[PDB]
Amino acid sequence: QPFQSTLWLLVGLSVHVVAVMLYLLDRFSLTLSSAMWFSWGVLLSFSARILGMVWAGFAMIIVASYTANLAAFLVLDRPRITGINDPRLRNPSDKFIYATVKQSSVDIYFRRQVC
Amino acid sequence: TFENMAGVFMLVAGGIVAGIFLIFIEIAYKRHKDAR
Amino acid sequence: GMMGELLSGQADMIVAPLTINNERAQYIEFSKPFKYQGLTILVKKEIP
Amino acid sequence: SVWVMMFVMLLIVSAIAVFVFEYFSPSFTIGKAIWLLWGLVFNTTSKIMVSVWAFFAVIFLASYTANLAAFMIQDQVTGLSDKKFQRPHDYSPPFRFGTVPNGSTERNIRNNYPYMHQYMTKFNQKGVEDALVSLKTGKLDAFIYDAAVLNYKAGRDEGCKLVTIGSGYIFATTGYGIALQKGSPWKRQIDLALLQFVGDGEMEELETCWLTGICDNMAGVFYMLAAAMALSLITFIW
Amino acid sequence: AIWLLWGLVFNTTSKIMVSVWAFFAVIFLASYTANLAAFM
């Protein structure tokens, strides 16, 4: 997933910091993995209601961002060459090499054509 | 705001207004059916 | 119009947004231009 | 007005079912309504009318997400009226501006900003092409020269890293043309021909011959995280 | 097992490794649906 690989750790950090806060809240009115199980189940009541709401918001934000990124990348990358009208032909660098066979009609056309 | 949003906003009010009357008449219909 | 009024003596100096054409320049001298603009197409807004 | 619309709709839907539940009482207090409302999103014969509304809301949010995804697929100094040009010593990195000597824009700058020579003299060059390599190597920050030359340099630049400031900002246009000596009677013969060439399209067809050129999520996540942290801390306090 | 497999789509410590696979499959099918929508 080369779609901003530096930002994928942020999602993991976000989904990890919630677990310890949930466990602390549960301990302040279910020891090791119950909080993680509940979080993953709701990702798949006062404070608990707010936690569910923020988890739903996180899921909605994640799915919306994924859909937007996919839609953008489908058109921005991996969709060209036009021809003489392309200004890069008039100023060709070493990156692109234009070549043909000598003593042909192409040489005569290039010699006769202006600009 | 948008046309779809405006349509949904106009439709939900009519839907809930119709549903209130539907529930009110359905309660009476169920009570009458149970009485019979 | 304005060119006819100038040629008839009713006016001497023309200060207005007047374009530059070959026919106009063949009879009326033009000073330095103010701004460089062209012609565009105007279309009324269409609701979505 | 979607925000106010949903704000006034949530209040209505937080009682449209509470009234029915209260009428059915003769079930518990508003906690049930809150639970149902917050479980309705994502994943008794009166629940059909709220299930259909939930399905409609799911369709609406899917359409909103699709519209946002479709919309998501489609800076520097604003000109010479910035205080940085007047006082380049305000910031730790000094501004590196200059131009070739014995030119034409230097006198125009002098007639308007005569105090810029103290900085122009320290960054003078011996050629227009030296500005490009100076900028590439960091020896200069910007190049002050004619707009036409800059457009060609941007068009022929490798990688398109060089670009004119803004959307082609032009100040003191005074476009140049063909010069002619005093007293020459050929001005009336040449100006008409040049105007005819311009108006007949010779300039437009010859433009392509030479004038060739090539032409946030993080903030939202941070704001949402800050809002969630604030809600969590205020809930813990309360 | 058949019921769990057929209910896994859309909406004991060994269920974590199948729940993560279910989430990955949901992401995959969402991507497939997006690609199909964009292909039209």
Ligand SMILES: *[C@@H]1O[C@H](CO)[C@@H](O)[C@H](O)[C@H]1NC(C)=O
């Ligand atoms: C500019 O003119 C001065 C005249 O004294 C001359 O010494 C200098 O070499 C000239 N510079 C360029 C780049 O022509």
